[PDB]
Design a protein around this ligand. Structure first.
Ligand SMILES: CCCCCCCCCCCCCCCCCC(=O)OC[C@H](COP(=O)([O-])OCC(O)COP(=O)([O-])OC[C@@H](COC(=O)CCCCCCCCCCCCCCCCC)OC(=O)CCCCCCCCCCCCCCCCC)OC(=O)CCCCCCCCCCCCCCCCC
Ligand SMILES: CCCCCCCCCCCCCCCCCC(=O)OC[C@H](COP(=O)([O-])OCC[N+](C)(C)C)OC(=O)CCCCCCCCCCCCCCCCC
Ligand SMILES: CCCCCCCCCCCCCCCCCC(=O)OC[C@H](COP(=O)([O-])OCC[N+](C)(C)C)OC(=O)CCCCCCCCCCCCCCCCC
Ligand SMILES: CCCCCCCCCCCCCCCCCC(=O)OC[C@H](COP(=O)(O)OCCN)OC(=O)CCCCCCCCCCCCCCCCC
Ligand SMILES: CCCCCCCCCCCCCCCCCC(=O)OC[C@H](COP(=O)(O)OCCN)OC(=O)CCCCCCCCCCCCCCCCC
Ligand SMILES: CCCCCCCCCCCCO[C@@H]1O[C@H](CO)[C@@H](O[C@H]2O[C@H](CO)[C@@H](O)[C@H](O)[C@H]2O)[C@H](O)[C@H]1O
Ligand SMILES: CCCCCCCCCCCCO[C@@H]1O[C@H](CO)[C@@H](O[C@H]2O[C@H](CO)[C@@H](O)[C@H](O)[C@H]2O)[C@H](O)[C@H]1O
Ligand code: SF4
Ligand code: SF4
Ligand code: SF4
Lengths: 207, 176, 115, 76, 114, 155, 114, 94
């Protein structure tokens, strides 16, 4: 119990590992990977076809009972051919436990909408469509939610520039707000911060 | 542990039922609410007489920025650019070169006070206490341009406010 | 003549204040300034579109009840009659029938607004 | 009114600005002959829907490439 | 090259959805001008709609076409429901952008942009 | 002497206008919380004659208290145009002043002065309630210095 | 035991006959589980936990003492969970998740950091 | 604090509380605005020996996730069922 180091909890690590393979045994058709982090969080990585079967099972199964969708989001990794990682964070009140379910898609492949499983997923999928451009099939009402009306692009993609492409001002001649190509009085100053010395040997990739 | 906020069955005896009828017909609970606002009418108000009286502040207050000097009059800033690196808003802009006596000193030190989030990271990062956030908060301007501070403005602020800034630093530097 | 003069003065005074209000200040009229207000965004549809009345039945009942007060207002004068036996009976009969009419509309859910 | 329907359809095709009435014939082809494109053809069909007050589904509209082909279609 | 479709099995089905969208936009321009009190004519509005479809005429992937149609319907719904304001409808016409000549010499005189 | 008369009438209309500034009930983000504290008992803006009114038709001042996004910009301009005149704009906090923490975002207007004219800029993130009050009193003194009738007399 | 006045959860009505209702529901779940392949992990695990719950229901005639053994909250919460399990079992008949993995991911799909 | 006796009684009666004991305006009970200097303590790593950083390096103890299954017996739940909450004994019903 060194004072500055976060203590381990092996009991939680063991319990989550056992449940991880329990889920893999029951849904082998869709489960591609199961892992538990060193701070005791369980992740199920699945084929995208399994979004509805897997999420239904975790919600309704008597030994799972993940009734609450805490969060639904996406991550963009341009180096992958399926660049978008879709992440579901679920909470089980009955068993006081959390689980993460992850799948993937590319710019042109639809993902089945999870609104039938969780009504909470409605706006989360609109946000993912808005910020990443991932289409969700059978969504009752898919449209932008955060961006401006008529906004072009998906800002949270890694290749969308920080300041975008257009900016707004009031123009007296046309007596309205107009959109024009972005110019910055002071360009954002890119910093190269990474140290050229490796920090964490435990995570070194093979050469 | 938990408690129920609203789970109580009213008593159905004659006295209780007649107490509730009086409350309904004679508005007793509404009259009680009138008593509370009446008691406030006769309390001393909490208002202070600004600008003749001021709200209290502490030595840690983060206000207008200033560039400081050593007791000799030399500038403290040696253009390390730690403040510029840490600034969450990228509100600081710095240029530097050797001074005519070889000193390491800035030729530009701008703070865009309309970018700045007044977070105090720059004064935490400074190794020589050159850049600080002073105690002034009454510097609203009539134009946007007046809030784009260059080094001359920031040095004047330091010269203007140093008497208070040094006393504030004295009060709080043992907490840093 | 005093009543007519008092009314004329009141509405003349109000009209003069409105004349000053419109001819004293400096105006700067343009399209966006005079557009209708809806919290910063353009209205969807005309404000002249039908606006459903959910208390329509109470409103019609008001017309009938509003006329009952016209029958009841003479009661202070009717109390000056020598024929007080008849007047009191008829006075109570009218109020009771108004109460019965209110009770009917109440029990038959006529005072509840349409959903 | 098969005789008349040839006239209303020709009147609309005349009004449609992009079509030169000198090159227009009851057998003129919108793409090959009258020099129009798919969207122009779609525009013409909506003009037909107006003056005849009835709907031409896109499955139907895709085959009407000549003024006569429209005439044959209104008959039913 | 076996991929999950969005809506259209092939370009023939996609071009049907494109024509359906074009009709919906074409009918809508007269209302948009009237409702938004725009100072342009229905002809300019429909020419702009035509210009927007034309820039994408070179696509051959049905999935890309489907997404363009999905966005087109989203854009149309925003307009019909007056979620857009007049400023949004007029952003298609770029009325305040100065001309940017597109010949080598003109660019050479103004700067380094190719 | 007309000069004397117009000078005194300027003082009266200026005094009436600065003594009765009615800001629009309009706030955008965290800066609006400090604006609430200016209305709260410690500062009691109402004691200066400064009273919020929701309708733009009945407002003299727009306090832009928070970040102005691109999506919100047309609505801010709309309700400013719907204010009768004279009208004033106080820019409160870094976001409204020039973008602030979100200056480089794709969705943020870099300063509300791109959308509306601004009479006073109140610095801070957020400005303290006292700082905002200082800005309101600075606006009052700006209105006190106006010379509308003296300039009209010399036209 | 004396009846519950409320379950404490908005919209969850008290059940007058919880033992009988639970027996019906678990029996249904076992019936539906009989059309799933014998070696499918879902059937084996759900049969095991369903039979445990059913055994506890038969062996405990008191609701409060039964709620303690079930460890699923109010008895009306256990009934709702039994209904949710039945609905899932019917769906898993049509999904057949016991079949082999439909497709492997690309090479570096789950590699982090990149 | 300067309210006369009659006014104190009036607002005490109207509110139904003894308001003078818990006034919402602050007087002399607050801390002085000048304070003696502090002398803050140091942490457990302020030692001159037996203090090698490698033995107290939390960041370097983090490990990549444990791969339970990849595509390269009793039923379980994620954790034991949650224990039912108890009613408060301080005040079970408000
Ligand atoms: C129309 C009505 C008005 C016309 C009648 C005017 C009558 C004269 C008013 C005298 C007020 C002057 C107070 C004073 O001496 O200043 C003290 C003050 C110095 O005392 P202090 O150090 O502040 O201490 C204050 C007390 O400790 C803290 O303050 P306090 O709350 O303890 O008040 C002290 C005193 C102050 O009260 C008065 O002196 C006036 C009482 C008149 C009551 C009229 C109603 O009141 C009392 O002692 C209680 C008896 C008064 C009657 C209370 C009944 C309340 C209503 C019942 C509840 C239910 C209502 C329904 O000096 C000043 O600030 C001078 C300011 C002058 C202000 C203008 C006063 C004139 C008001 C208008 C005149 C008419 C035109
Ligand atoms: C109808 C006629 C109504 C006459 C209104 C009289 C205005 C009185 C007044 O100005 O207050 C004193 C004011 C008070 O000054 P002030 O408004 O600048 O004070 C600032 C606020 N304090 C004092 C708290 C810091 O005196 C003047 O400023 C002169 C204004 C002259 C107004 C024109 C009169 C003709
Ligand atoms: C409850 C009742 C309360 C009623 C209170 C009534 C107000 C009492 C205080 C009166 C003060 C004097 C009024 C000055 C305000 C004028 C508005 C203003 O600021 O304009 C600036 C303008 C400035 O104009 P400008 O020429 O400098 O420039 C404006 C034009 N642009 C925008 C292009 C620059 O002042 C004037 O134009 C004229 C000032 C005249 C001052 C004398 C007032 C005479 C009013 C008579 C008008 C004739 C119509 C009749 C109206 C009814 C008569 C009572
Ligand atoms: C000899 C035999 C004699 C025979 C005659 C005997 C007659 C006397 C006995 C009859 C009862 C007398 C009192 C009748 C008063 C009217 C009662 C009434 O209507 O109030 C009840 C009303 C009910 O509403 P609610 O509580 O929400 O629930 C009702 C469920 N349907 O609730 C309300 O109306 C609440 C009103 C809300 C708005 C109140 C806001 C102001 C409150 C402060 C007012 C203080 C009173 C000031 C009076 C000043 C008069 C100058
Ligand atoms: C025998 C035949 C004799 C016929 C005699 C009548 C002849 C009429 C002459 C017409 C003169 C044209 C005047 C135009 C005019 O009055 O408009 C200008 C002015 C409004 O002001 P504006 O100029 O638009 O700009 C400043 C706004 N603050 O003024 C206005 O328009 C405002 C009018 C308000 C209504 C008062 C009537
Ligand atoms: C839905 C239909 C409902 C119908 C309801 C009808 C209610 C009628 C109730 C009875 C009201 C009148 O009751 C009656 O009032 C009169 C006075 O006016 C009284 O009359 C008494 O006083 C009057 C003077 O005031 C004398 O002239 C008279 O000789 C004397 O008998 C009667 O003693 C009393 O019996
Ligand atoms: C002669 C003048 C003096 C006599 C008073 C004359 C007016 C009498 C009005 C009698 C009304 C009786 O009929 C009325 O009908 C409704 C049914 O919709 C009843 O019940 C309903 O209304 C009440 C109040 O709205 C609700 O609390 C109740 O949940 C609802 O079921 C009323 O409790 C009852 O009061
Ligand atoms: S206070 Fe914060 S935002 Fe402002 S200049 Fe310093 S580091 Fe930058
Ligand atoms: S102000 Fe301080 S931190 Fe910033 S450049 Fe100067 S010495 Fe470095
Ligand atoms: S200036 Fe600061 S406090 Fe004000 S809205 Fe922006 S981030 Fe929030």
């Amino acid at each position: 119990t060194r004072p500055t180091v976060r203590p381990r909890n092996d009991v939680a690590h063991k319990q989550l590992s056992a449940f991880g393979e329990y889920v893999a045994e029951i849904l082998p058709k869709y489960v591609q990977q199961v892992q538990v982090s060193c701070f005791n969080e369980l992740e199920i990585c699945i084929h995208p076809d399994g979004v509805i079967p897997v999420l239904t099972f975790l919600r309704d199964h008597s030994n799972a009972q993940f009734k609450s969708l805490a969060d639904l989001t996406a991550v963009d990794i341009p180096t992958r051919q399926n660049r978008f990682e879709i992440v579901y964070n679920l909470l089980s009140l009955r068993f006081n436990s959390r689980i993460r379910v992850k799948t993937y898609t590319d710019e042109l492949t639809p993902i089945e909408s999870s609104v039938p499983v969780y009504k909470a997923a409605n706006w989360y999928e609109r946000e993912i469509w808005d910020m990443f451009g991932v289409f969700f099939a059978n969504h009752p009402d898919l449209r932008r939610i955060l961006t401006d009306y008529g906004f072009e692009g998906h800002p949270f993609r890694k290749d969308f520039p920080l300041s975008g492409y257009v900016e707004l001002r009031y123009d007296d001649e046309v007596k309205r707000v107009v959109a024009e190509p972005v110019e910055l009085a002071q360009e954002f100053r890119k910093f190269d911060l990474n140290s050229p010395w490796e920090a964490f040997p435990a995570y070194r990739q093979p050469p | 542990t938990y408690k129920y906020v609203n789970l109580r069955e009213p008593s159905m005896d004659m006295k209780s039922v007649t107490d509730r009828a009086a409350q309904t017909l004679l508005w007793t609970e509404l009259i009680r609410g009138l008593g509370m606002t009446l008691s406030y009418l006769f309390r001393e108000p909490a208002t202070i007489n600004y600008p003749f009286e001021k709200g209290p502040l502490s030595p840690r207050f983060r206000g207008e920025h200033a560039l400081r000097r050593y007791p000799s009059g030399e500038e403290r800033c040696i253009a390390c650019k730690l403040c510029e690196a840490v600034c969450p808003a990228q509100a600081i802009t710095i240029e530097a070169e050797p001074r005519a006596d070889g000193s390491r000193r800035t030729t530009r030190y701008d703070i865009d006070m309309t970018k700045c989030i007044y977070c105090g990271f720059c004064q935490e990062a400074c190794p020589v206490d050159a850049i600080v956030e002073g105690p002034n908060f009454e510097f609203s301007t009539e134009t946007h341009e007046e809030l784009l501070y260059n080094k001359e403005k920031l040095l004047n602020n330091g010269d203007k406010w140093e008497a208070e800034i040094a006393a504030n630093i004295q009060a709080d530097y043992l907490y840093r | 003549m005093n009543l007519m003069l008092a009314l004329l003065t009141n509405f003349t005074l109000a009209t003069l204040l409105v004349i000053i209000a419109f001819w004293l200040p400096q105006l700067n009229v343009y399209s966006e300034k005079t557009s209708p207000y809806e919290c910063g965004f353009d209205p969807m549809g005309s404000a002249r579109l039908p606006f459903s009345m959910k208390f329509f039945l109470v409103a019609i009942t008001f017309l009938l009840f509003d006329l009952e007060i016209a029958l009841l207002l003479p009661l202070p004068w009717a109390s000056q009659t020598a024929n007080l036996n008849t007047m009191l009976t008829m006075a109570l009969f009218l109020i009771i029938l108004l109460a019965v009419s209110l009770a009917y509309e109440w029990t038959q859910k006529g005072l509840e607004w349409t959903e | 009114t098969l005789e008349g329907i040839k006239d209303r359809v020709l009147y609309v095709l005349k009004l449609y600005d992009k079509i030169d009435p000198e090159k227009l014939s009851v057998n003129s082809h919108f793409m090959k002959d009258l020099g129009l494109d798919s969207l122009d053809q779609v525009e013409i069909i909506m003009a037909m829907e107006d003056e005849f007050g009835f709907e031409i589904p896109d499955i139907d509209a895709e085959k009407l490439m000549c003024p006569q082909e429209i005439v044959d279609y209104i008959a039913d | 090259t076996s991929v999950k479709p969005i809506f259209s099995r092939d370009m023939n089905e996609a071009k049907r959805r494109v024509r359906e969208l074009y009709r919906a936009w074409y009918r809508e321009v007269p209302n948009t001008v009237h409702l938004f009190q725009l100072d342009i004519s229905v002809k300019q509005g429909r020419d702009k709609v035509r210009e927007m479809f034309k820039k994408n005429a070179h696509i051959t992937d049905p999935r890309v076409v489907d997404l363009l149609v999905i966005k087109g319907k989203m854009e149309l719904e925003e307009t019909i429901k007056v979620w857009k304001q007049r400023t949004h409808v007029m952003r298609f016409f770029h009325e305040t952008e100065a001309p940017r000549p597109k010949d080598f010499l003109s660019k050479f005189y103004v700067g380094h942009d190719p | 002497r007309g000069e004397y008369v117009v000078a005194k009438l300027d003082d009266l209309i200026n005094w009436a206008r600065r003594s009765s500034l009615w800001p629009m009930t309009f706030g955008l983000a965290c800066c609006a919380v400090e604006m609430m504290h200016m209305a709260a008992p410690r500062y009691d803006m109402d004691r200066f004659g400064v009273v919020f009114r929701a309708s733009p038709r009945q407002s003299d001042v727009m306090i832009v208290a928070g970040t102005l996004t691109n999506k919100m910009a047309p609505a801010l301009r709309k309700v400013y145009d719907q204010m009768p005149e004279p009208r004033y704009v106080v820019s409160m906090g870094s976001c409204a002043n020039g973008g602030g923490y979100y200056h480089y975002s794709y969705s943020v207007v870099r300063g509300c002065d791109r959308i509306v004219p601004v009479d006073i800029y109140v610095p801070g993130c957020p400005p303290t309630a006292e700082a905002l009050l200082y800005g309101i009193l600075q606006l009052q003194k700006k209105i006190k210095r106006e010379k509308r009738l003296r300039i009209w007399y010399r036209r | 035991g004396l009846l519950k006045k409320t379950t404490g959860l908005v919209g969850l009505a008290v059940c007058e006959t919880p033992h009988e209702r639970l027996k019906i529901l678990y029996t249904k779940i076992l019936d539906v589980l009989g059309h799933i392949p014998k070696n499918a992990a879902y059937r084996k695990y759900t049969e095991q936990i369903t039979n445990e719950k059913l055994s506890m229901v038969k062996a405990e005639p008191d609701v409060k003492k039964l709620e303690e053994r079930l460890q699923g909250g109010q008895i009306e919460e256990v009934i709702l969970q039994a209904e949710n399990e039945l609905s899932l079992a019917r769906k898993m008949i049509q999904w057949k998740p016991w079949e082999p993995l439909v497709e492997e991911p690309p090479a570096s799909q789950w590699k982090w950091p990149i | 604090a300067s309210a006369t006796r009659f006014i104190q009684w009036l607002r005490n009666w109207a509110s139904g509380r003894d308001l003078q004991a818990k006034l919402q305006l602050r007087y002399q009970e607050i801390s002085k605005r000048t304070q003696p200097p502090p002398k803050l303590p140091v942490g457990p790593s302020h030692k001159l020996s037996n203090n090698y950083y490698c033995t107290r390096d939390g960041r370097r103890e983090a490990m990549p996730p444990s791969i339970v299954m990849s595509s390269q017996k009793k039923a379980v739940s994620p954790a034991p069922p949650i224990k039912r909450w108890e009613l408060s004994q301080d005040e079970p019903y408000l």
